[PDB]
Amino acid sequence: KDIKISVVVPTYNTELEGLKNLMASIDKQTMNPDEYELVFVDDGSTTDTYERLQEFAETRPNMTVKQIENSGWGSRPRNIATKMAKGEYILYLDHDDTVFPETFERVYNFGKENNLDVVSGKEVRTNGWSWGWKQFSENNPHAEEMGIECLLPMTPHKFYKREFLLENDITFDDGARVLWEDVYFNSKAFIHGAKVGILADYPTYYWIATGGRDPHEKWNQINKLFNFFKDNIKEQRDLDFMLTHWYRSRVLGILGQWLLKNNNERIDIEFNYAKKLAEELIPAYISENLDKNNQVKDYLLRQGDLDSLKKLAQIDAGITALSYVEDAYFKEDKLFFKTSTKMTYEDKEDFFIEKTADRMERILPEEIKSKLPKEFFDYSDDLAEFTYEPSIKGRNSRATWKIDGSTSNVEVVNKKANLYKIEGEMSFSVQINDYILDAADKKQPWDIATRFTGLGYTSHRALTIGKILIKTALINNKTMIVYKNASGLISLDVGSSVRSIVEDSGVKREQILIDKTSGKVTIPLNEIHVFGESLIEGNAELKPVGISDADPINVKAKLIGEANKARVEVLLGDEKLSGEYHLVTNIQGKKDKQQIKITL
Amino acid sequence: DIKISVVVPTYNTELEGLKNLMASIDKQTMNPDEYELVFVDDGSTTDTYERLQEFAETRPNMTVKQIENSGWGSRPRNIATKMAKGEYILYLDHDDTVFPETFERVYNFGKENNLDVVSGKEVRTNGWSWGWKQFSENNPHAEEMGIECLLPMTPHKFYKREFLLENDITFDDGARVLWEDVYFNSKAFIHGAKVGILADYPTYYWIATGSFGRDPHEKWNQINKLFNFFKDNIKEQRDLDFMLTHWYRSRVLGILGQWLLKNNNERIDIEFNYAKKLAEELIPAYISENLDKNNQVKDYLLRQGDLDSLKKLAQIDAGITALSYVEDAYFKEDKLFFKTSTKMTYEDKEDFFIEKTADRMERILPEEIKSKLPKEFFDYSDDLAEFTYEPSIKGRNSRATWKIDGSTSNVEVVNKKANLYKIEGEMSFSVQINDYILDAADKKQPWDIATRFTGLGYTSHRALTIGKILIKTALINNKTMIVYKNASGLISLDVGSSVRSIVEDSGVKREQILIDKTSGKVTIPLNEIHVFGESLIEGNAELKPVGISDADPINVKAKLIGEANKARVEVLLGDEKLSGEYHLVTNIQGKKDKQQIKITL
Ligand SMILES: [Mg+2]
Ligand SMILES: [Mg+2]
């Protein structure tokens, strides 16, 4: 039949565990296995990786395992596996990553119905509160109209139409040690006019963190990358974006706190390379596309003023925006938050800007202020561009999502004299179903964070609270617990992944009902928000008081939510019991610690 | 004519701790022929007693005497007291030390005011204060304020031996009891002792080193014995009410706060029942009227046996603190000025709130608990003008803490939102480091600055902190001073180059280094530094020829000069016949700079 997707996996001394997880993620795919193929190419492993791949391919007719040499200096397994691929779309999956169980089906149906050459699906990384925060915000079947920006982040973990790659001969550069090999690949795809679509409503690829250092090798590659942009990108809008994006992130990105973390010898090497790269490759008009703080860095870089840049890094050290929980409560079937934040230095004293004449200036010493153009430390034009947004991250899937529907407001307040602070307030609600897309997501801890940007600073940090916060809810067969974790950060347990809803709700101990004839023991929950109907099956353990090593007597239990009240019913069944017993409930794998004792 | 008698009971003493004790007594400014050492070993099983017989071989005024084993150190203190012949007695433990000017300052203070008990300033290893209220000023007639003048009731005071033996004031010789030093001090005041507080000099260092009492039944059996001692022996009504109010709040109600969140239900149920039984039997009702709102709440819930509501209030009050942020720090004239701010929060995060219902500011409580309490106990209206906001300092070496006088502070109850009110404080103060330099060793020491905030029944004494990087140097009348955000994010003041190099932190005007044609004097001006008054600090420099890898360095004398509001390092070469380019590393007060200074000669 017609192969819809080809999975390209290059391998070399692959960890067996990560390879097992990779094969499991492919087997979990909702797409019929005869509609995709797996193309593995071993790069001459010194371990038994190729022997394990053959054992995998025995029971999988859609799997192909090829073994080459050590790439012969100038050869790449991804190109070799591409020439033998037969599918309509190709995914370049690394040997220690995984793929979500509905990726193939969702990605293919999206690319087919929009005739896409590149499908850029939502990507997930182990660490961080976001990835592709701007691009993975909504589905865009005609993303290539945005310009070359639609392909960011330019990982090789997209779905490329095999017909498009072979026609334009888009391969991976056959250099043994080329960095950002995927940036060349994605840029070449767009230069040849690829129809690009962004699939954002479902996480498609998990880039797992497993884990350059040579400043000469690093800056040799940075020069090679900018020379690629200037020589190949012919559309002005696209070229200006790549020049601006990589000059800000990689070139100016060493002129900040990087100066405070490296010795003066390494600083001299990279700063001299950066200044040489700015003057030769980066046009002056790129400065127009930068924010005020990056314009200051760009100006001092070309001036060779490394001394003023080091002082500026010390002055800027620790600027951040941390959000405190002002209120948190369940209402109907949602969890509501009210937060507050302000720009500070390390969550301590406020960050200030100064008002001189009708200008809102960056607070700087006069010695540095005289060295800079007057407009570069004036924030007057940017005091209405603040963003304040909430986000959520699943602790198991590592997938991050923006929490939609929030209302926020950021004010520039005159605290004293001519000094102004930046304060924000936000209120949002979380409908947990908006982020449950796989069955595995139903039972998972969730972590809440806030993203605050303004005046050139991006501050995306976990939501925090100081007071003790533990609030439970039972909403339409979903057990939900919002709590301050041991790090003072806000977490949301759904499905009893880490906490016990009976233990955190409490037990009206003096209201336990023992129905001896029906054999039912009713244990009502104390503090808990109950909405809708709920019946969660579980079990419980009875143990006679006094007998040390008594076997637990296993009985059926169920957590019930009805009429805005929660209770656990324990059914004694055919058990013949007499005396005092310990009663421990076991709902969703979590045992309470309420020390319940009943007399039968 | 012996002036001071020192009593030291020893038992299995650490070899290093006992050695440091003898050094603190030998370095006393008082003439050694005016004080004696009376050691009494309480039946040591190790070789501790054999070490004392070695210390007494060289010192003539040191006596050693081993006595039958008795457990606690009250028997050796009683037997050493009878065999003493000094006018004043100091009970010194085998793990503590004494400051050099203690004997001279204490004796003059006690004899010029005819004092029976001299309560000198005591220093502990940890904490930002000790005796904050009592050790604030000198008071030659402190017994007029009541038994309060003897707090803290440690045995590390100076009691006139004439007064002790005449009134038969001894330590309990029987089974080991807790707070036996409280018995001793109280018995001394009951007999009408003229107490004097010497607060201007640290007299004693109670060193935190590294036992019965963990048992709750044993713990609360001791608390009952101490309370019965107060009701039976203290005759003055004012002095009895104080001792009852002080100890019922600290040790009885003290387990009804955050202590409930640190123990299991079983230990809590045992100690809570003891506390409820003791408050009903020994603590009259009129004592609770002398307590703050939060303690009146705990007192009411204790007698009602409502441990469930006390556990819930502990979780509501957990984390209430007040951390001070640096708003401004600068040197001016000969002092270091600070502007700080603070507000009550939960663990330096969200604000702490009190709510306004009708015309009364109330503690924010759940309705289930608020309906169980009298309305007056959660009404903070009468207490909104009783906030305090003060600064304090602590020497990292001497461990001594001091209130920083002359501060200006204001605390506000501000309507943040709706009917919720926060508590904000602003404070400005200055530091005169010569106020806290009393011994020669204090001239080279790191100093840590803290702030103390009290209000609504909460006390928060924490180190001053700052987020932004802060480094500012000064050269003030031969004192090198560096205020800075330390590695822990707290405010520290280095004096005498104990941790940081003033040349390194000030900066060098490299393009203004002068080399005289004939004199051969190298002048290195400092960039950013506050210079006030004349200064001259003798140091040295190091020279290495540029190029030669492992060339032997050239050590030469240098000096840091403060003059005309400018600092500079003058490197006097002289006899050193040198030519070519050389590296120059200054070394002022044992701290070398990293300015990469090169000169050509
Ligand atoms: Mg990986
Ligand atoms: Mg804070």
PDB file of N, CA and C in Angstrom, chain A residues 508-540:
ATOM      1  N   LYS A 508     -14.569  13.915  58.303  1.00  0.00           N
ATOM      2  CA  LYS A 508     -15.483  14.205  59.407  1.00  0.00           C
ATOM      3  C   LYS A 508     -15.579  12.944  60.261  1.00  0.00           C
ATOM      4  N   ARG A 509     -14.572  12.772  61.122  1.00  0.00           N
ATOM      5  CA  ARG A 509     -14.397  11.517  61.847  1.00  0.00           C
ATOM      6  C   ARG A 509     -15.608  11.196  62.715  1.00  0.00           C
ATOM      7  N   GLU A 510     -16.225  12.216  63.303  1.00  0.00           N
ATOM      8  CA  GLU A 510     -17.377  12.022  64.172  1.00  0.00           C
ATOM      9  C   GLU A 510     -18.677  11.825  63.402  1.00  0.00           C
ATOM     10  N   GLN A 511     -18.617  11.722  62.073  1.00  0.00           N
ATOM     11  CA  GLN A 511     -19.804  11.540  61.244  1.00  0.00           C
ATOM     12  C   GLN A 511     -19.724  10.273  60.401  1.00  0.00           C
ATOM     13  N   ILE A 512     -18.819   9.357  60.744  1.00  0.00           N
ATOM     14  CA  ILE A 512     -18.732   8.088  60.035  1.00  0.00           C
ATOM     15  C   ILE A 512     -19.924   7.221  60.414  1.00  0.00           C
ATOM     16  N   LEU A 513     -20.578   6.648  59.408  1.00  0.00           N
ATOM     17  CA  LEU A 513     -21.773   5.835  59.597  1.00  0.00           C
ATOM     18  C   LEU A 513     -21.432   4.377  59.325  1.00  0.00           C
ATOM     19  N   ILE A 514     -21.697   3.515  60.299  1.00  0.00           N
ATOM     20  CA  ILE A 514     -21.508   2.077  60.153  1.00  0.00           C
ATOM     21  C   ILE A 514     -22.886   1.444  60.023  1.00  0.00           C
ATOM     22  N   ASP A 515     -23.234   1.031  58.807  1.00  0.00           N
ATOM     23  CA  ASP A 515     -24.474   0.302  58.549  1.00  0.00           C
ATOM     24  C   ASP A 515     -24.146  -1.184  58.627  1.00  0.00           C
ATOM     25  N   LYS A 516     -24.449  -1.798  59.773  1.00  0.00           N
ATOM     26  CA  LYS A 516     -24.025  -3.174  60.006  1.00  0.00           C
ATOM     27  C   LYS A 516     -24.800  -4.154  59.134  1.00  0.00           C
ATOM     28  N   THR A 517     -26.088  -3.888  58.901  1.00  0.00           N
ATOM     29  CA  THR A 517     -26.897  -4.815  58.115  1.00  0.00           C
ATOM     30  C   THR A 517     -26.529  -4.758  56.637  1.00  0.00           C
ATOM     31  N   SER A 518     -26.354  -3.557  56.089  1.00  0.00           N
ATOM     32  CA  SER A 518     -25.934  -3.434  54.700  1.00  0.00           C
ATOM     33  C   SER A 518     -24.428  -3.577  54.528  1.00  0.00           C
ATOM     34  N   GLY A 519     -23.668  -3.595  55.622  1.00  0.00           N
ATOM     35  CA  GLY A 519     -22.229  -3.735  55.536  1.00  0.00           C
ATOM     36  C   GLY A 519     -21.509  -2.559  54.922  1.00  0.00           C
ATOM     37  N   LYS A 520     -22.107  -1.372  54.949  1.00  0.00           N
ATOM     38  CA  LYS A 520     -21.530  -0.186  54.330  1.00  0.00           C
ATOM     39  C   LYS A 520     -21.026   0.769  55.403  1.00  0.00           C
ATOM     40  N   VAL A 521     -19.793   1.239  55.239  1.00  0.00           N
ATOM     41  CA  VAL A 521     -19.198   2.247  56.108  1.00  0.00           C
ATOM     42  C   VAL A 521     -19.021   3.514  55.284  1.00  0.00           C
ATOM     43  N   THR A 522     -19.683   4.589  55.698  1.00  0.00           N
ATOM     44  CA  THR A 522     -19.645   5.857  54.981  1.00  0.00           C
ATOM     45  C   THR A 522     -18.672   6.808  55.665  1.00  0.00           C
ATOM     46  N   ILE A 523     -17.743   7.351  54.891  1.00  0.00           N
ATOM     47  CA  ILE A 523     -16.719   8.260  55.386  1.00  0.00           C
ATOM     48  C   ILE A 523     -16.818   9.562  54.601  1.00  0.00           C
ATOM     49  N   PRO A 524     -17.513  10.565  55.132  1.00  0.00           N
ATOM     50  CA  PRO A 524     -17.637  11.839  54.415  1.00  0.00           C
ATOM     51  C   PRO A 524     -16.361  12.663  54.495  1.00  0.00           C
ATOM     52  N   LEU A 525     -16.067  13.364  53.404  1.00  0.00           N
ATOM     53  CA  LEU A 525     -14.886  14.209  53.321  1.00  0.00           C
ATOM     54  C   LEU A 525     -15.196  15.604  53.850  1.00  0.00           C
ATOM     55  N   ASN A 526     -14.188  16.228  54.459  1.00  0.00           N
ATOM     56  CA  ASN A 526     -14.402  17.482  55.170  1.00  0.00           C
ATOM     57  C   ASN A 526     -14.371  18.674  54.221  1.00  0.00           C
ATOM     58  N   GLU A 527     -13.176  19.162  53.896  1.00  0.00           N
ATOM     59  CA  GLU A 527     -13.007  20.344  53.056  1.00  0.00           C
ATOM     60  C   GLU A 527     -12.685  19.905  51.630  1.00  0.00           C
ATOM     61  N   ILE A 528     -13.649  20.068  50.726  1.00  0.00           N
ATOM     62  CA  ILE A 528     -13.474  19.660  49.337  1.00  0.00           C
ATOM     63  C   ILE A 528     -14.558  20.329  48.504  1.00  0.00           C
ATOM     64  N   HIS A 529     -14.174  20.790  47.317  1.00  0.00           N
ATOM     65  CA  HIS A 529     -15.108  21.375  46.364  1.00  0.00           C
ATOM     66  C   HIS A 529     -15.664  20.264  45.483  1.00  0.00           C
ATOM     67  N   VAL A 530     -16.986  20.115  45.467  1.00  0.00           N
ATOM     68  CA  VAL A 530     -17.646  19.036  44.740  1.00  0.00           C
ATOM     69  C   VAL A 530     -18.555  19.642  43.680  1.00  0.00           C
ATOM     70  N   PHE A 531     -18.367  19.215  42.434  1.00  0.00           N
ATOM     71  CA  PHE A 531     -19.160  19.693  41.313  1.00  0.00           C
ATOM     72  C   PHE A 531     -19.472  18.521  40.396  1.00  0.00           C
ATOM     73  N   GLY A 532     -20.721  18.443  39.948  1.00  0.00           N
ATOM     74  CA  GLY A 532     -21.147  17.360  39.083  1.00  0.00           C
ATOM     75  C   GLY A 532     -21.184  16.024  39.809  1.00  0.00           C
ATOM     76  N   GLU A 533     -21.502  14.985  39.042  1.00  0.00           N
ATOM     77  CA  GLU A 533     -21.557  13.627  39.564  1.00  0.00           C
ATOM     78  C   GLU A 533     -20.197  12.957  39.427  1.00  0.00           C
ATOM     79  N   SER A 534     -19.827  12.170  40.436  1.00  0.00           N
ATOM     80  CA  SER A 534     -18.538  11.492  40.437  1.00  0.00           C
ATOM     81  C   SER A 534     -18.663  10.153  41.149  1.00  0.00           C
ATOM     82  N   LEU A 535     -18.107   9.107  40.537  1.00  0.00           N
ATOM     83  CA  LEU A 535     -18.014   7.785  41.159  1.00  0.00           C
ATOM     84  C   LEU A 535     -16.686   7.176  40.720  1.00  0.00           C
ATOM     85  N   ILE A 536     -15.717   7.155  41.630  1.00  0.00           N
ATOM     86  CA  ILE A 536     -14.390   6.613  41.365  1.00  0.00           C
ATOM     87  C   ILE A 536     -14.223   5.354  42.201  1.00  0.00           C
ATOM     88  N   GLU A 537     -14.057   4.219  41.530  1.00  0.00           N
ATOM     89  CA  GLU A 537     -13.897   2.946  42.217  1.00  0.00           C
ATOM     90  C   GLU A 537     -12.500   2.834  42.817  1.00  0.00           C
ATOM     91  N   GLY A 538     -12.418   2.207  43.978  1.00  0.00           N
ATOM     92  CA  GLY A 538     -11.155   1.998  44.665  1.00  0.00           C
ATOM     93  C   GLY A 538     -11.247   0.784  45.557  1.00  0.00           C
ATOM     94  N   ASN A 539     -10.489   0.803  46.648  1.00  0.00           N
ATOM     95  CA  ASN A 539     -10.532  -0.269  47.634  1.00  0.00           C
ATOM     96  C   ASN A 539     -10.044   0.289  48.966  1.00  0.00           C
ATOM     97  N   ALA A 540     -10.082  -0.555  49.994  1.00  0.00           N
ATOM     98  CA  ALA A 540      -9.649  -0.162  51.326  1.00  0.00           C
ATOM     99  C   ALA A 540      -9.139  -1.393  52.060  1.00  0.00           C
TER     100      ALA A 540
END
